[PDB]
Ligand binder design. Structure first.
Ligand SMILES: CC[N+](CC)(CC)Cc1ccccc1
Ligand SMILES: CC[N+](CC)(CC)Cc1ccccc1
Ligand SMILES: [Mg+2]
Ligand SMILES: [Mg+2]
Lengths: 481, 501
């Protein structure tokens, strides 16, 4: 339309806009708890089974039938498409429970036109409520004077109009051109102050070791360089002085030969413990990003990595023929370096990429990897490769996003909440729920609790640190605020 | 300003007040702190993370693990130091005597202190001055911390304190300062004297209202309390049963604010229940009764106790049924579950509910009750109740019903009070099921302890229509069938809400 081209930003509703008696269910107050993400469908159907005096299975079939009867609106989708081509900022703002949102994301394919998807079950907010409009506007930094909102309901358009956003009621299209927390900041400030103090005191990132993921009763072991590299890659808002001190510890790490890095400091290296491609890939990828190394110096190390494939063609974990292992996340971090340096189209990487893609798509990642038992870690690292090399990894985006959507608010560990927040936001989905619960678990000194990010399987030793946890939580807070 | 050195003069000033608030740390209890890394527990307790533990936001393992990094001290040394500190704890003989004297003067006496749940659990078992308090307000049970004014606002509101007649005793001036802002007079406890200064939410009610409207409408429409059955405790996808009378009787005993019109309607269901004969009741309606399934003492006890309470039946009519129950003992003397020699069963909650009716009708001194009462007592004390009972798998159900009996007949069950309180404290916030939170809140408050943690978490699981989720309260053990309803869950939750406001 000639109307929408006057606006920089268009916000789309889903229902009866892009998609076209179960009404007694969706009007019930319990359904609003479901829409808000407060409960899941199983518990919501149990309750509604009682209030609606209907066998639970009948409500499930009525709902299943109702979702599958949804059909795209071809006029609106094409409209969405033309706006996308015009480089508009486009957002989706809609009430829908989480599982329905999973089905609809899998089932349709217009999602790609959106710069950002704001769904009620991921926000714990519902669409007539002005709070959801205010959340959208500040989080997306929307200039309401150049923003128009498309909905079928007048309550929604009236609310948006009160924030100064024009409206298009979707037969007829009614157009009206409209012309007219500090707790987060405190928690961010506390956390930044905590992280900056820890890392200024100990730029070689500390770690602790134990036999459990919470590292209860863990002992101090601060003689591996990997955590330092993880933080440098993962928390993108370190002050320059800290970046420098941590870079210094990497460049001067003594578990180092010919740009092959070892996990351990020399003093702590088990006799005969080999260099590994995870530590090597991660530090090399950081040094190249910060212009401490050239592709010329890295490429021979990358060939050794290609030389390290097993009989199935998969690049292995260690520079040691007598210690053959594989790991989907080590595969990912190798592939990241490969695409960074120009190796992205080497045929010898095909089975390593196939392995990673299959690990995603088979849901085998729900079992964790050899060194990373928590499934969201695989998803997070995959999202880094997929979003940073999007043309090369196009076919990963939708399946990765599907998996992440189902895992929103599925675990209580703060670091796991952080990874889901960061990964979903990089994929254009706003996960406010995990964000809210992440804030609640900050400790009083500003740091989050220790978490066992990775594992030495031979000794079932978990490694982790408050620095790692806090670094991820701060990235999550910054990326959504 | 008024410096006091005379223990006599102290007693004379405290007597001028109706309410005395006592601190624990360095007032009633005293301890030492210096025992690779730090060598002073004072460095732990001062740390910000320790405030999270004190407020109940984390447990000891969690706080130590974090402190082991901040204080650069091996976690296991921090653990040893705490245990040594706690083991070193001594009672203050002067202040417990002052406390005891105030108690013997029928003063209203409260305890307000910062202590973490594990520590407070140990202290409660270890010492025995707690009986002198009318109410106990501990930071880990309140998720509030003592300097903060809102812990004072909470105490004053929870206990309906007249701050004009209230005096607070504490060793920390910051605590006294904050108390004086609320008009409470202060008494600083020093190593060498006393300093005496004479001094002159909306969400909760919305939730209460919504929950009351929910339950009143549900019980009006279905005064025979509905029930669902499934093989799992949250009854996900459970089927409608609604053919047992016991839920109706449990609601009448457990939620004490039903309007008279609902009470009348539910009482009619009990009296017109076809599964009864000569004032013995059967769990099931006839249409669902298994062939040869007997009447049982649990439904009977709870039904007769209610009908007596509401003057539907005389003591004269109950006492013969109660004598039959005494005739239902086994070779160990424990009263059994069913009116049926061919189906011998014992269950500790059924025993509790039979004992309740016994004491209520005048049978409380009958010697034939001894083995039943010792069964329930050993069941508590042996921690065997952590395994559930035959018909009630959730451990807090046994503690809840025990607390009804023990608080309602306190002269006969004195020896139960402290062990039961000890157990309940260890269970604060130990499970997520709303009904279980509600049982713990209700039971602890009857025992004088405010469990605000479970309360706040209970509030957050109310659904938008005012009802709580269904929960399987009791079990048909053979088929592993759970029974429950939203009415049951909401009734226990509303009672917990009322009892803590
Ligand atoms: C970077 C080290 N690693 C893989 C070698 C992380 C995935 C785990 C590990 C650490 C120490 C011993 C063994 C394995
Ligand atoms: C009062 C009913 N009863 C004991 C008879 C106590 C909860 C459980 C029960 C219900 C149904 C069948 C068997 C036992
Ligand atoms: Mg709509
Ligand atoms: Mg004190």
């Amino acid at each position: 339309s000639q109307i929408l081209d006057r606006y920089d930003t268009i916000v789309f509703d889903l229902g009866d806009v892009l998609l076209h008696d179960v009404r007694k269910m969706v009007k019930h107050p319990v359904w609003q708890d479901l829409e808000k993400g407060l409960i899941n469908q199983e518990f919501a159907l149990t309750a509604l089974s009682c209030e609606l005096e209907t066998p639970c299975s009948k409500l499930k079939e009525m709902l299943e039938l109702s979702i599958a009867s949804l059909q795209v609106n071809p006029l609106m989708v094409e409209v969405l498409r033309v706006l996308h081509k015009k480089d508009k900022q486009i957002y989706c703002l809609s009430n829908v429970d989480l599982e329905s949102f999973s089905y609809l994301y899998k089932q349709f394919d217009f999602w790609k036109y959106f710069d950002g998807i704001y769904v009620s079950a991921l926000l714990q907010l519902r669409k007539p409520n002005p709070d959801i409009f205010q959340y959208l506007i500040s989080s997306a930094s929307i200039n309401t004077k150049s923003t128009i909102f498309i909905d079928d309901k007048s309550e929604n358009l009236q609310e948006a109009a009160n924030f100064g956003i024009s409206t298009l009621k979707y037969d007829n299209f009614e157009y009206t051109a409209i012309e007219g927390t500090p707790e987060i900041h405190k928690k961010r400030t506390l956390g930044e102050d905590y992280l900056n103090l820890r890392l200024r005191k100990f730029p070689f990132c500390k770690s602790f070791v134990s036999n459990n993921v919470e590292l209860i009763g863990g002992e101090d072991f601060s003689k591996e360089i990997f955590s330092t590299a993880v933080i440098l890659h993962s928390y993108t808002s370190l002050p320059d002085d800290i970046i420098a001190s941590m870079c210094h510890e990497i460049l001067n790490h003594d578990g180092q030969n010919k740009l092959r890095w070892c996990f351990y400091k020399n003093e702590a290296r088990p006799d005969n413990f080999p260099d590994d491609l995870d530590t090597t890939s991660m530090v090399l990828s950081f040094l190249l990003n910060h212009n401490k190394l050239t592709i010329e110096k890295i490429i021979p190390v990358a060939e050794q990595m290609i030389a390290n494939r097993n009989e199935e063609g998969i690049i292995q974990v260690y520079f040691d023929d007598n210690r053959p292992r594989i790991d989907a996340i080590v595969a990912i971090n190798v592939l990241y370096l490969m695409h960074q340096i120009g190796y992205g189209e080497r045929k010898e990487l095909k089975e390593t990429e196939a392995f990673v893609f299959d690990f995603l798509i088979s849901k085998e990642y729900l079992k964790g990897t050899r060194y990373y038992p928590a499934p969201d870690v695989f998803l997070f690292f995959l999202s880094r490769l997929v979003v940073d090399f999007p043309d090369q990894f196009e076919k990963f985006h939708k399946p990765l996003t599907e998996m992440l959507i189902t895992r929103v608010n599925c675990s209580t560990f703060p670091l796991e909440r952080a990874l889901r927040i960061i990964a979903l936001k990089k994929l254009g989905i706003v996960n406010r729920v995990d964000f809210l619960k992440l804030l609640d678990t900050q400790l009083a000194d500003g740091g989050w609790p220790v978490y066992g990010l990775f594992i030495a399987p031979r000794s079932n030793t978990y490694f982790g640190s408050r620095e790692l946890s806090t670094a991820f939580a701060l990235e999550a807070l910054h990326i959504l605020s």
